[PDB]
Amino acid sequence: HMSRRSFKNRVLAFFKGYPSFYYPATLVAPVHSAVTSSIMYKVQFDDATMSTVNSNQIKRFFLKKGDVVQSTRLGKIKHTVVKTFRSTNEQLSLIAVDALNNDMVILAHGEIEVTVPISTIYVAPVNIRRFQGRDLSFSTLKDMKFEETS
Amino acid sequence: HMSRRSFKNRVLAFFKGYPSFYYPATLVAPVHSAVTSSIMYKVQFDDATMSTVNSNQIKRFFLKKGDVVQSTRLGKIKHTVVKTFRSTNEQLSLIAVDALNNDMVILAHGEIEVTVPISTIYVAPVNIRRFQGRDLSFSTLKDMKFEETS
Amino acid sequence: RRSFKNRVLAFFKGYPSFYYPATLVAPVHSAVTSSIMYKVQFDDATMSTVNSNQIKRFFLKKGDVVQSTRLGKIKHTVVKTFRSTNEQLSLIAVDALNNDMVILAHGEIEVTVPISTIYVAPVNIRRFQGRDLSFSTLKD
Amino acid sequence: RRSFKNRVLAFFKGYPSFYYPATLVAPVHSAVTSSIMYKVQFDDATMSTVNSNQIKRFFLKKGDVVQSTRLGKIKHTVVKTFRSTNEQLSLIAVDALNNDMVILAHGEIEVTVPISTIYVAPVNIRRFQGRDLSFSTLKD
Amino acid sequence: SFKNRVLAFFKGYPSFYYPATLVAPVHSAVTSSIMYKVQFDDATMSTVNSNQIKRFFLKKGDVVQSTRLGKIKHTVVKTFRSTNEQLSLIAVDALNNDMVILAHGEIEVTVPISTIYVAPVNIRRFQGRDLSFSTLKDMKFE
Amino acid sequence: SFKNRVLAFFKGYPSFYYPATLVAPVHSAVTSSIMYKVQFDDATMSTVNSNQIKRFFLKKGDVVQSTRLGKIKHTVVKTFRSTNEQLSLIAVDALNNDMVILAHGEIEVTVPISTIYVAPVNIRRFQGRDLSFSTLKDMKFE
Numbered sequence: 001h002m003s004r005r006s007f008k009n010r011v012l013a014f015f016k017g018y019p020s021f022y023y024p025a026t027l028v029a030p031v032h033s034a035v036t037s038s039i040m041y042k043v044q045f046d047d048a049t050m051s052t053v054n055s056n057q058i059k060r061f062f063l064k065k066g067d068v069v070q071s072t073r074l075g076k077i078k079h080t081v082v083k084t085f086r087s088t089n090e091q092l093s094l095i096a097v098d099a100l101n102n103d104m105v106i107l108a109h110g111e112i113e114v115t116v117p118i119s120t121i122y123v124a125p126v127n128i129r130r131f132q133g134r135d136l137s138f139s140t141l142k143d144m145k146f147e148e149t150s
Numbered sequence: 151h152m153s154r155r156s157f158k159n160r161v162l163a164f165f166k167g168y169p170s171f172y173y174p175a176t177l178v179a180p181v182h183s184a185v186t187s188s189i190m191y192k193v194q195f196d197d198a199t200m201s202t203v204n205s206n207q208i209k210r211f212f213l214k215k216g217d218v219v220q221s222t223r224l225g226k227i228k229h230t231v232v233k234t235f236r237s238t239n240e241q242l243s244l245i246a247v248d249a250l251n252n253d254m255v256i257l258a259h260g261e262i263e264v265t266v267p268i269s270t271i272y273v274a275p276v277n278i279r280r281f282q283g284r285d286l287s288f289s290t291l292k293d294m295k296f297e298e299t300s
Numbered sequence: 301r302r303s304f305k306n307r308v309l310a311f312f313k314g315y316p317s318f319y320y321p322a323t324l325v326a327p328v329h330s331a332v333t334s335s336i337m338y339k340v341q342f343d344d345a346t347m348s349t350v351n352s353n354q355i356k357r358f359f360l361k362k363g364d365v366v367q368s369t370r371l372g373k374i375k376h377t378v379v380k381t382f383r384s385t386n387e388q389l390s391l392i393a394v395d396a397l398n399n400d401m402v403i404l405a406h407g408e409i410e411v412t413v414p415i416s417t418i419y420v421a422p423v424n425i426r427r428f429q430g431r432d433l434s435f436s437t438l439k440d
Numbered sequence: 441r442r443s444f445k446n447r448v449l450a451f452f453k454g455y456p457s458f459y460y461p462a463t464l465v466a467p468v469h470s471a472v473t474s475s476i477m478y479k480v481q482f483d484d485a486t487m488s489t490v491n492s493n494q495i496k497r498f499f500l501k502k503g504d505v506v507q508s509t510r511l512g513k514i515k516h517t518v519v520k521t522f523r524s525t526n527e528q529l530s531l532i533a534v535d536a537l538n539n540d541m542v543i544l545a546h547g548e549i550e551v552t553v554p555i556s557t558i559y560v561a562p563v564n565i566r567r568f569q570g571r572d573l574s575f576s577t578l579k580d
Numbered sequence: 581s582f583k584n585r586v587l588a589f590f591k592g593y594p595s596f597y598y599p600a601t602l603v604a605p606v607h608s609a610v611t612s613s614i615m616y617k618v619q620f621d622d623a624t625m626s627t628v629n630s631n632q633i634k635r636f637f638l639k640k641g642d643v644v645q646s647t648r649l650g651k652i653k654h655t656v657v658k659t660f661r662s663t664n665e666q667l668s669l670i671a672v673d674a675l676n677n678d679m680v681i682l683a684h685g686e687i688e689v690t691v692p693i694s695t696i697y698v699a700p701v702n703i704r705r706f707q708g709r710d711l712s713f714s715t716l717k718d719m720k721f722e
Numbered sequence: 723s724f725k726n727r728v729l730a731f732f733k734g735y736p737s738f739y740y741p742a743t744l745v746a747p748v749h750s751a752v753t754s755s756i757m758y759k760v761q762f763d764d765a766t767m768s769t770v771n772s773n774q775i776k777r778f779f780l781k782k783g784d785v786v787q788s789t790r791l792g793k794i795k796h797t798v799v800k801t802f803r804s805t806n807e808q809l810s811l812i813a814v815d816a817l818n819n820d821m822v823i824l825a826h827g828e829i830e831v832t833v834p835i836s837t838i839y840v841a842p843v844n845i846r847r848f849q850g851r852d853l854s855f856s857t858l859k860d861m862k863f864e
Contacts, residue, residue, distance in 0.1 A: 001179075001295035019333065029151075031455050034485065035509060035559060040455075048298035052455060056592070068648060076331045076650050093296065122332060125594050126647050126697065129622055145151035146243065148198035150453030150486045169473065181315050184345065185369060185419060190315075202315060206734070218790060226471045226792050272472060275736050276789050276839065279764055300313030300346045 002048050002094070003028060008140060010099040012123055013043040014057035021070075022123040024061055025051075026094055027136070029145050042145065046095040046119060059134040061098035063105060063118075068127045071107060072120040078127075079107035084118060095119055152198050152244070153178060158290060160249040162273055163193040164207035171220075172273040174211055175201075176244055177286070179295050192295065196245040196269060209284040211248035213255060213268075218277045221257060222270040228277075229257035234268060245269055301325070301341070301391060304398040306438050309420060310340040311354035318367075319420040321358060322348065323391060324433075324440050338433075343392045343416060356431040358395040360402055360415075365424040368404060369417040375424070376404035381415065392416055441465070441481070441531060444538040446578050449560060450480040451494035458507075459560040461498060462488065463531060464573075464580050478573075483532045483556060496571040498535040500542055500555075505564040508544060509557040515564070516544035521555065532556055583715060585674040587698055588618040589632035596645070597698040599636055600626075601669060602711075605719045621670045621694060634709040636673045638680060638693070643702035646682060646691040657681040659693060670694055725857060727816040729840055730760040731774035738787070739840040741778055742768075743811060744853075747861045763812045763836060776851040778815045780822060780835070785844035788824060788833040799823040801835060812836055 005026050013025040024046055031040040031052050042052050063069070067081040084102040097103055098118045105118045155176050163175040174196055181190040181202050192202050213219070217231040234252040247253055248268045255268045302323050310322040321343055328337040328349065338355050340348030360366065364378040381399040393400045395415050403412050420428075433440075442463050450462040461483055468477040468489065478495050480488030500506065504518040521539040533540045535555050543552050560568075573580075581601065588600040600618035606627045608615045616628040638644065642656040662679040671678045673693050680693045723743065730742040742760035748769045750757045758770040780786065784798040804821040813820045815835050822835045 002298045004293065004296055019331070021332075032485075033455055034452060034460065035456060035458070046298075072332050078648060078650060126596075126645075130647065132622070143154065146154055147454045148152045148196075149489050150482070169471070171472075182345075183315055184312060184320065185316060185318070222472050228790060228792060276738075276787075280789065282764070297314045299349050300342070 003044060005094070007094065007097045007101045008099055010061040010094070010097060011041075011043060011136070012059045012061050012121075012128070012134075013041070013045070013051065013053055014125065015045065016051060016053065016057075020125060022059070022125065022128050024095070024098070024119055024121060027058070027140065027142075030142055032144065055136075058136065059128065059131055060136055060140070061118075062100055062134065063098065063121070064131075064133075067131060069107070069121050069123050071105075071116045072122065073116055074107070074109075074114065077109055078124075079109045079114075082106040082108050082113055153194060155244070157244065157247045157251045158249055160211040160244070160247060161191075161193060161286070162209045162211050162271075162278070162284075163191070163195070163201065163203055164275065165195065166201060166203065166207075170275060172209070172275065172278050174245070174248070174269055174271060177208070177290065177292075180292055182294065205286075208286065209278065209281055210286055210290070211268075212250055212284065213248065213271070214281075214283075217281060219257070219271050219273050221255075221266045222272065223266055224257070224259075224264065227259055228274075229259045229264075232256040232258050232263055303438055304391065304394045305396055306440050307358035307391070307394060307396045308338075308340060308433075309356045309358050309418075309425065310338075310342070310348065310350050311422070312342065314345070318422065319356070319425050321392070321395070321416055321418060324355075324438075326439060352433070355433060356425060356428060357433060359397050359399075359431065360395065360418070361428075361430055364420075364428060366402075366404070366418050366420045368402075368413045369419070370413045371404065371411065371417075374406060375421070376406040376411070379403035379405050379410055443578055444531065444534045445536055446580050447498035447531070447534060447536045448478075448480060448573075449496045449498050449558075449565065450478075450482070450488065450490050451562070452482065454485070458562065459496070459565050461532070461535070461556055461558060464495075464578075466579060492573070495573060496565060496568060497573060499537050499539075499571065500535065500558070501568075501570055504560075504568060506542075506544070506558050506560045508542075508553045509559070510553045511544065511551065511557075514546060515561070516546040516551070519543035519545050519550055581669060582672050582676050583674055585636035585669075585672060586616075586618060586711070587634045587636050587703070587709075588616070588620070588626065588628055589700065589703075590620070591626065595700070597632075597634070597700065597703050599670070599673075599694055599696065602633075602715065602719075605721055607721065633711065634703065634706060635711055635715070637675050637677075637709060638673065638696070639706075639708075642698075642706060644680075644682070644696050644698050647695045647697065648691045649682070649689065652684055654682040654684050657683050657688060662690075723811060724814050724818050725816055727778035727811075727814060728758075728760060728853070729776045729778050729845070729851075730758070730762070730768065730770055731842065731845075732762070733768065737842070739774075739776070739842065739845050741812070741815075741836055741838065744775075744857065744861075747863055749863065775853065776845065776848060777853055777857070779817050779819075779851060780815065780838070781848075781850075784840075784848060786822075786824070786838050786840050789837045789839065790833045791824070791831065794826055796824040796826050799825050799830060804832075 009027040011025050011027050012022040015023050025043040028042040028044050031042050033040055040052055040054055041058055044050050063081045063084050068078055084105045086102050087104045096119050102118050106113055106115050159177040161175050161177050162172040165173050175193040178192040178194050181192050183190055190202055190204055191208055194200050213231045213234050218228055234255045236252050237254045246269050252268050256263055256265050306324040308322050308324050309319040312320050322340040325339045325341050338350050340350050360378045360381050365375050381402045383399050384401045389400050393416055400415050402415050403410050446464040448462050448464050449459040452460050462480040465479045465481050478490050480490050500518045500521050505515050521542045523539050524541045529540050533556055540555050542555050543550050584602045586600050586602050587597040589597050600620045603617040603619050606615040606617050616633050618628055619625050638656045638659050659677040659680045661677050667678055671694055678693055681688055726744045728742050728744050729739040731739050742762045745759040745761050748757040748759050758775050760770055761767050780798045780801050801819040801822045803819050809820055813836055820835055823830055
């Protein structure tokens with residue numbers, strides 16, 4: 001694993017290592033930092049890597065028409081989002097969906113459209129600054145990790 | 151953390167490292183081994199160490215009158231269990247309780263009794279062979295870890 | 301699916317995390333990285349994907365230390381591999397050679413096992429020399 | 441609770457896992473082991489318990505690299521510690537010395553901070569020499 | 581306004597100059613330098629020293645980026661107005677242009693001018709894009 | 723029975739000799755040696771080669787352990803019957819004793835004889851505790 005949360009916990013989280021992009025992850029838990037006051041977030045990437053990010057480094061994983069994104073299957077070519085949808089009625093795994101339980105996204109580059117899995121999305125931080133209405137909602141919430149000894 | 155299961159998941163699990171005793175742990179998940187057919191168990195010790203054990207290396211954490219055990223606060227002196235109980239009505243953490251949500255145990259050495267926290271128990275494998283009625287029950291059950299990539 | 305030439309030994313991310321026989325389904329490129337990854341299929345419990353550091357071509361050589369699901373958890377040394385039949389075998393029965401069957405030593409008993417029962421501890425695969433990936437392909 | 445002489449810097453098992461000021465409440469012995477552990481109380485978010493490898497006596501020396509919650513995430517070098525008042529201070533304000541207050545350099549600004557705002561990266565505490573545990577006690 | 585469009589340094593991550601509207605000069609409590617309140621196009625507000633603000637207009641040859649393009653080198657070919665229709669403030673530069681052509685090698689591409697952003701190093705090369713004269717004369721605390 | 727009480731090697735973990743009742747001789751499909759079906763006091767069944775089974779009786783000086791005691795050295799002082807009451811089979815040794823005194827240095831302690839277990843190395847020192855003569859004469863497959 002790969003830990004085990006509702007699809008509504010899917011985020012795009014800033015990957016702090018070194019290619020710097022936002023990637024799909026699961027919001028795992030709020031973090032109280034011993035050393036700073038802002039609230040923070042433990043997040044898990046789809047390769048199961050775990051990371052703690054601030055509130056400026058995390059968005060709900062939902063995509064709107066006109067969002068500029070990239071996809072892992074189309075190189076570094078920037079696309080705009082046309083529409084996200086769910087391709088199936090079967091149970092899908094957490095790494096396959098976004099925060100609304102979609103599965104697939106249609107992307108445009110020009111007026112050339114391609115349909116790609118939503119799990120393949122990644123986002124440049126400059127593109128993320130224009131995502132409006134994508135902050136974590138109150139209804140996302142949630143337990144502190146039961147810290148061992150400390 | 152320290153992961154986040156009902157108290158009914160509390161076990162005494164064989165610690166495979168090197169003092170060999172059974173210690174209090176939480177049953178985390180069943181494990182399918184790629185390489186052997188018996189069912190196996192991911193278990194977490196109270197210091198948050200994680201381990202995978204077979205069905206011969208795990209008991210429900212409940213204690214019966216006459217069980218021979220040791221306690222972390224009484225050195226290596228073997229005691230028999232007199233009675234387990236819950237000292238409080240407040241929410242207690244997982245590492246503080248056994249499988250019935252007790253908290254405290256009374257231990258005898260001779261007819262000298264001492265009251266000690268149940269989390270302090272540990273058990274010699276030779277003593278564990280005489281625990282009857284302590285195997286995992288069907289009602290304990292339970293999800294496979296959502297394995298990342300594999 | 302693939303030619304026998306795509307058979308690999310790949311790090312398994314479940315339990316226990318050893319190297320197991322798989323088929324290299326497709327290399328995976330960039331720019332999520334720069335780096336090459338490999339999409340790997342196990343004989344079966346899974347599609348794959350694995351590091352450049354987590355994969356070898358499936359061919360055993362005299363001296364390799366391996367284990368077999370037929371033989372407990374005792375490590376055994378490879379004597380040789382051979383082909384036991386001119387019948388057509390599934391991909392899953394075969395290494396990268398197209399050998400099925402391997403002879404394994406351990407202290408003068410030599411036992412012969414089907415090549416698909418093989419797995420290799422990470423420590424033992426670190427000492428493998430002839431067996432790094434390339435190619436060009438196949439569909440490798 | 442304890443004398444100022446029990447003030448330690450202890451590995452914190454929450455986030456982030458640095459060394460923070462604490463009070464050594466009690467040593468813990470055996471036979472769950474053989475080994476000595478230490479029960480440690482932080483200034484406050486917790487009772488403790490910690491390794492022999494995860495604890496130092498709380499006294500800073502010229503040259504120590506540390507950080508302070510007053511001063512961002514910039515590491516600063518210790519100039520000295522001193523006592524700023526003859527009034528009675530809580531245990532939590534004080535190191536193992538009974539000094540409150542530390543002078544911290546960073547490139548010619550020397551800023552003075554309350555000793556309780558101090559924390560030390562594990563890498564920097566690895567380079568601390570005068571400061572290993574002992575005693576006998578106290579209630580250390 | 582339109583004449584109040586500027587390129588302003590963003591202190592947060594990532595740190596580039598972005599299109600903004602100049603809101604007011606600001607007398608700051610912690611510094612004695614004159615500061616500039618700007619509103620960025622995501623509508624977040626920020627002030628801004630005088631080393632961190634230019635008039636928003638581009639000249640052929642400027643090294644700039646677009647949010648629509650990847651991070652390879654681009655240079656300004658020309659700016660212009662793509663419509664006579666009446667555009668929002670946040671669509672235009674300080675000359676009321678909304679569209680720029682950028683080049684990389686022999687490839688050219690049109691991007692909306694609002695989509696532009698500039699590395700401080702290349703901003704330092706800009707000649708003639710300080711505030712004002714009018715912007716200066718006309719300002720204006722609160 | 724009582725005469726059917728033996729100390730039998732446990733193949734599982736941990737591997738000591740424990741009290742058991744001899745159930746039957748066994749002709750084994752995979753070996754040609756005679757084997758012994760024993761039932762251990764936790765009531766699990768096991769068979770057992772002839773190198774893995776003794777008559778259950780102790781002599782002063784034997785090096786043995788008790789499930790009631792820690793794993794420091796203990797030696798048998800004496801065995802005996804602690805009651806005239808009629809005891810279960812699993813409470814007794816092959817001589818119908820239920821109680822043993824063990825020593826470590828100048829400390830002695832009574833433990834129930836059913837509680838005893840023996841390291842193979844110390845079992846190898848036991849003289850005179852092979853099965854039978856009667857146990858042998860009287861056996862008995864199925």
